C-alpha cells in the first residue's frame, strides 16, 4: 500500500543545486487531475510520475508543469532514469525506455560520486518556421530588448517534441530580459509552445513559464534543440560533447551536456542527486 | 539525513490549502541549512522547530524563499497539527510556539480528516491611512484603476507584519497583476506587503514583494483583514467568520477567524497531513 515519492536534483554534481524535480515512481493510482493536484502541491517546475508495466526497464511517463501537462522528452526523465536505477540497484550502466503519449525515450544511468550521471537520446530535431524581419523585432521587444540585441543567426522554432522558438541574443541583451507581453498568439502563428533565449557564443540560456514569472533552472526540453541548432549553423562541433549553461539568474548555475551525432540524434545527459524519500500518508 | 513533512493549511482536503513543509526537529541545522532547504522544497514558506524547555513548548523559524518572517501565521497551525500527530492525545492538545520574542498560543483537536487547528494573534494593530493619492497609485501598481477601490479606506493593519489591505472590487481583484516596484511607498506607510481584499465577497490575494509567487492562503494577513472587516462594520465583532483565499491557484482555502470581544484576534483552520518525508543527503 506505500506510495512514495522522492525529491531530486537534476544537472547537479552537489545536493541543493540543479533543478528540483519530483518523482512518483509509482503513480499507478492517480488519475489526470491527482497528477495535477500533486504536481502543484510539490511546487517543483516540473513533478513526473512513472507507470510500471511487465518490463522492468520500461515504464510510461507523465511530465507535468504546476500549468499544464507537457508530455514531451524533459530533464524529468533523467531524473526518472537516476531513481529507476537507485531502487534497481546495480554497479553497472544500467538501460530504461521511458514512453510519453508522442515517443519512446532510450536513456542510460550510471553511478557518479554520491549520486548518478544519466543520459538520454532525443532523436533529430525538427527545425520549423523561421519568424520574417518584423516578428523578430516583435520577441526581442516582449523581452524589453531591442532588434539590434538580437545576433546575427535567424531565430528559428526547434523541437524534439516541445517546440521552443530559439531567440538568439546578445550576452549582455540576456541579463536585462524581462517578459513584458503576451506571448500566446504570437507563438501559435510560429507552431511554437515557449521562447527560449540563447546567447550562441556564450551557450548560454534563459527561459520562463508562459507568464514570465518563474525561471526555469535547467530546461532539458530545450537542451536538445539548443544542441541542433548550435551544430546546424556551425557553431559548434558535430560528434563531440560540449556544455550548455542555465540558471546563474537564479543563483543555481546548472551544466547541461549535450551532443549532436552523424545520424542527427541529441543527447542530453547530466549529473542527478537523491535528495529525499516521502511516504504518502493519505488515501490512495 | 533527518525528517520533514508535507502539510496542508486552510484545507478541507488534501491537496488544496496552503502547502507547508514542517522539520520537526532542527535542532542541527544552521540557519543557511534552513533557507536552503525552503528554497529547495519551493513551499511558500517552511517551518523549523526546535525543543522548548517545556514538551509543549517549541521554538519556531519561518523562511519564505526570500527572507525569515518571524510572525504569527499559517505556518503555526501545520505546526500544532504535526506536534498533535507526533505527540499523540484525544482532546484539545495547546502548544506555545515562539517567533522571537513572542509567545504564540495554539490549540489543535484531531478532525475526522487531518486535524483542526486556531492561533491566537493577539490585538490587531492599525496603522497609516493613505491619502487618496496614493491608495490610486498603489491600485495601479496592480493593473487597477481607481475606480477599481472599492471606497473602503485602505489601512495598514498588522498582527506583527503589517500589511497595507487595499479594498477593490471583486472584479479588480480577478485582473489584478504587480507592475511597479512597491518598496519605496511601502515603506513611508510602515508595512512590508500589499494584500489586495475584497470586502464584500471576503476573498483576499496576495505575492511576493515582487509580485511574482502568488501566496494560497495568508495566515498572517487574515488577522488583520479579520480586524480591519470587524473595524469597518463589514463583520461583527464576537461573531467568527470565514475569508477565502487560493481560488487564483485552483486551491480554495477556508480561514475561520474572530475578533473576540475581549480584543483577541484568532485564526483557525483545517490542516491536512500529506506525507513524511527523509532525508537521503546530510
Redesign the interface.
Same mark, same amino acid.
Given at each position: 500500500m506505500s506510495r512514495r515519492?522522492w525529491?531530486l536534483?537534476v544537472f547537479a554534481e552537489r545536493?541543493?543545486t540543479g533543478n528540483?524535480l519530483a518523482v512518483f515512481d509509482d503513480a499507478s493510482a492517480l488519475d489526470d487531475a491527482?497528477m495535477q493536484?500533486?504536481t !502543484? /502541491?510539490? !511546487?517543483?517546475f516540473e513533478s513526473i510520475f512513472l507507470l510500471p508495466g511487465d518490463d522492468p526497464r520500461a515504464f510510461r511517463a507523465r511530465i507535468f508543469t504546476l500549468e499544464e501537462e507537457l508530455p514531451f522528452a524533459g530533464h524529468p526523465l533523467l531524473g526518472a532514469a537516476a531513481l529507476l536505477h537507485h531502487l534497481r540497484g546495480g554497479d553497472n550502466e544500467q538501460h530504461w525506455t521511458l514512453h510519453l503519449a508522442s515517443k519512446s525515450v532510450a536513456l542510460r544511468s550510471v553511478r557518479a560520486g554520491?549520486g548518478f550521471y544519466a543520459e538520454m537520446d532525443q532523436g533529430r530535431a525538427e527545425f520549423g518556421a523561421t519568424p520574417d524581419a518584423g516578428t523578430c523585432r516583435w520577441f526581442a521587444e516582449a523581452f524589453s530588448l531591442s532588434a539590434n540585441d538580437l545576433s546575427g543567426h535567424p531565430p528559428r522554432v526547434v523541437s524534439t517534441g516541445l517546440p521552443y522558438l530559439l531567440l538568439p541574443v546578445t550576452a549582455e541583451a540576456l541579463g536585462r530580459a524581462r517578459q513584458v507581453n503576451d506571448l500566446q498568439e504570437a507563438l501559435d502563428k510560429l507552431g511554437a509552445a515557449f521562447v527560449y533565449l540563447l546567447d550562441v557564443d556564450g551557450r548560454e540560456g534563459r527561459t520562463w513559464d508562459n507568464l514570465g514569472?518563474?525561471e526555469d533552472v535547467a530546461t532539458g526540453s530545450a537542451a536538445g534543440p539548443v544542441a541542433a541548432y548550435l551544430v546546424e549553423y556551425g557553431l559548434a562541433a558535430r560528434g563531440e560533447p560540449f556544455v550548455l549553461h542555465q540558471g546563474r539568474f537564479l543563483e543555481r548555475p546548472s551544466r547541461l551536456d549535450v551532443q549532436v551525432a552523424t545520424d542527427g540524434s541529441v543527447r542530453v545527459g547530466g549529473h542527478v542527486?537523491?535528495?529525499? !524519500?516521502? /511516504?504518502?500518508?493519505?488515501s490512495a
Open positions: 515519492y525529491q536534483d545536493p541543493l528540483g491527482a493536484a500533486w !502543484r /502541491e510539490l !511546487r517543483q554520491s514569472l518563474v542527486q537523491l535528495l529525499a !524519500r516521502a /511516504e504518502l500518508l493519505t
